Hints:
This is part of a larger assembly, with 1 copy of chain A (274 residues), 1 copy of chain B (221 residues), 1 copy of chain C (205 residues), 1 copy of chain D (9 residues) and 2 copies of chain E (99 residues). Chain A is of the alpha+beta class and 274 residues long. Chain A folds into 2 domains: 1-181, 2-Layer Sandwich (Murine Class I Major Histocompatibility Complex, H2-DB, Chain A, domain 1), CATH 3.30.500; 182-274, Immunoglobulin-like (Sandwich), CATH 2.60.40. Helix content of chain A is 24%, strand content 39%. Chain A has helices at 57-84, 139-150, 152-174, 176-179; strands at 3-12, 21-28, 31-37, 46-47, 94-103, 109-118, 121-126, 133-135, 186-193, 198-208, 214-219, 222-223, 228-230, 234-235, 241-250, 257-262, 270-272. Chain A is globular and about 65 Å long. Chain B has no helices and 19 strands. In chain B, β4 and β5 (46-51) form a beta hairpin. Chains in contact: A-B, A-C, A-D, A-E, B-C, C-E, E-F. Chain A binds chain D through residues 7, 24, 26, 59, 63, 66-67, 69-70, 72-74, 76-77, 80-81, 84, 99, 124, 139-140, 143, 146-147, 150, 152, 156, 159, 163-164, 166-167, and chain D through 1-9. It is classed as immune system. Keywords: human leukocyte antigen, HLA, HLA class I, antibodies, autoimmunity, Fab, alloreactive, immune system. Chain A: MHC class I antigen (Fragment). The organism of A is Homo sapiens.
Amino acid sequence: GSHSMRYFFTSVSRPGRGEPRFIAVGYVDDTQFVRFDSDAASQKMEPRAPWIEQEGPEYWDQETRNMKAHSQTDRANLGTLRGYYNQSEDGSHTIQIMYGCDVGPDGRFLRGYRQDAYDGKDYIALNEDLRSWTAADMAAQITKRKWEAVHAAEQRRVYLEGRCVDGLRRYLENGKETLQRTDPPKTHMTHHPISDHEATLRCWALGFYPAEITLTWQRDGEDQTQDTELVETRPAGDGTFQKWAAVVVPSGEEQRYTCHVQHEGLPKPLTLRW
Amino acid sequence: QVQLQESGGGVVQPGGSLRLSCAASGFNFSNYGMHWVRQTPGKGLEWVASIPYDGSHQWHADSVKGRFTISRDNSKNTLYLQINSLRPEDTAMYYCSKARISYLSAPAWWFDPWGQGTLVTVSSASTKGPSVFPLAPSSKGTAALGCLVKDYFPEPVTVSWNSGALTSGVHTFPAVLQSSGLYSLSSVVTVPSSSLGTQTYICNVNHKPSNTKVDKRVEPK
Amino acid sequence: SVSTQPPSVSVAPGQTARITCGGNNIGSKSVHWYRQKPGQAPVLVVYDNNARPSGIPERISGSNFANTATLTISRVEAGDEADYYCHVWDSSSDHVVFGGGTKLTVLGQPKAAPSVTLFPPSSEELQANKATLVCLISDFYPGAVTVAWKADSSPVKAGVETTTPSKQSNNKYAASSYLSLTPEQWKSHRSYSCQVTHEGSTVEK
Amino acid sequence: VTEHDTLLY
Amino acid sequence: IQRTPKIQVYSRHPAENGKSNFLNCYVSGFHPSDIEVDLLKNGERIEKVEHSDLSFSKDWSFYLLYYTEFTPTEKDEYACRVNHVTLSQPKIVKWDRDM
Amino acid sequence: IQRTPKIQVYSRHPAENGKSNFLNCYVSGFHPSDIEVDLLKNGERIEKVEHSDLSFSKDWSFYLLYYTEFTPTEKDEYACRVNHVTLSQPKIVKWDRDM
């Protein structure tokens, strides 16, 4: 299948302080590989993968400037938006940008992205075309037509289809061992009686990568979206993920409930029963 | 590139004689020692015998002295293991391995490649139908019951319940090879404690080697 | 002549596993280690106490001092599930001495104690002049159990057969243990018990 | 590789 | 506008008493970014605790993972305390062996 | 003016595993009178706890004793948490077998 690269930028205005706190994190698929923290004493884009510090000082130096600068702009932008929204200096507001690119199985270009959000709400975003912007609210339009003047539509496209993809390609090959793995889920089932008449059949799936996973409970081969509970996939802290899906069962009917697990690194879908 | 290929194993009967051969490629066979290491299925590794680079001497483990003889043909790049008066104890897989260091006058150092090996199984073989006895559930939660498929030969038997109409709770276990040389297998299906009685319980064991099919209905008490 | 390995070792993925091969003055012998995955031949992983072959990763290190040789696996991967045998040459024995073997289990499940289901001899088998006690052991992990039979608080040696553990559907392990008796011996004693031990704890019926 | 320059609102 | 944190507390590996594991507290789906997280060994604040770098999800809600090396026993019971702007009093989520 | 509480945690009788003893937390020398004291069976708040009635010493400093029935083992570790106006974060004094 495909692969992807995403960078996440967050800037939170500190009331009373100049430089807001800035955090930038870079992922490939589901493996983080770079970090930049305003409050870090490093003040340099640090490595967070095993395969990334094989890039020389030409890389880390440019990457630091690249988001030293990205932070600078957010400083000014946090103030510009403070005017667009008639907001006082005593507040704390967040600006979130996420941009990246998706390659196909043959290194082909598939999709580009850039989305900006002010205070957790959508602000401006780049359309599928990579030729158009869509503004969430009023203010974002006064930014939108400003970007339409400078052809920000195009110039994102020259990053997404140029240097972004060549990076994702160069990363997927340099860290080919870490990034192109598949990790089948290590599964097991749990039986917890709750009443004298009901229990809970929990379906575990630990240690898998990528995080894409499909858990399905089924009664007599019929899908059971009713008494089902599904926690969102949790990171185990070692680059792999966990997820469990439970169902409430009337006693003496556990041999009727079947848990189904689908994963990319799994050859045939799983089936689990008590 | 170094390849070892065992052969000559199979199914033998006690008292007979059997010859294993290990074909070698990928090194000057005339310069290395060779070893036989056997492993009874489900057991650890056990050294059998070994032979120096030329065949001068012949090292034997004590369990196989007098009955086994290890030889080699340097002109053929072949290691041989001769077994005389086969016994049920000799049933094991026989690996052949090549001494890593050259010119060793005695088999002291590690064995670097190992062949995939050959399997030697001896028994008083003759095809037999399996006797089916009902494993009734405990009259005194979850209730269990099943079938006992005793003393068949050779493998395998297949057990189904109600002609395959029951699969939930069904579990067939591996067969033991009792000291008689005949296999023995059980297969039970755990069910709900209550409600056993209403359902019709028939396990259908099928032993194709003897062309036997047995349908035994199980019932409590 | 006597080199003893633990029966099984369980370790969390990515942890450091450690398998020992204890023996009298084994520190003065040359220890080797072989790894055997199911259905294949052994593979040399450490030779002469600490040396690694070409293909073997540097995570695996050897050790041998005093009276205990030690195989050390740092940053355990899932593919390391296999049996591990140590190798010495007893100079004063003319015998190459393999260890008992250690089944290293890298757990994906939690650990489950075994479920024991014991059957008395059926009435049909008793009228066939035989009696066979059926002990069924299922749903344990890792797959390492030991079975003992007790006829009235007394051990039972011969007449006992026990299967090798095997993976179930849910990748827990299961095995069975049979005790062949004469119909008289089943009636001689007042009670029979099947004792299964798994990871230090013992379960019985 | 992060983007060369940035946009102001 | 504000979003309140989801909290899951779990071990990295299936927990076994006496074997070194890792205690994870995974807070997700919250907004804004200011959050306080501690790990608790029997009501005591665990000091050797680190966290992940602030990333966010599709709905722009942030997520962090706080982790500590720990060796669980059977009587030692651990928990995770999380204060937020959406929380008047800190929530505490105690670690269950099977959740 | 304020005084900060001293905390002593001890058992009523010399503790022996499997025999019913009583867990004492004795706060003394504090001012003003408002104090919160809990007993902890492995970090959880033990509910069946009573306390003594508020008396004071020569220097007008109050003292209380909170006690609970408990059967100590070797794995169970008990403790006493005492919050005060002079205490920014709750003090915790765990019950020692030889103190």
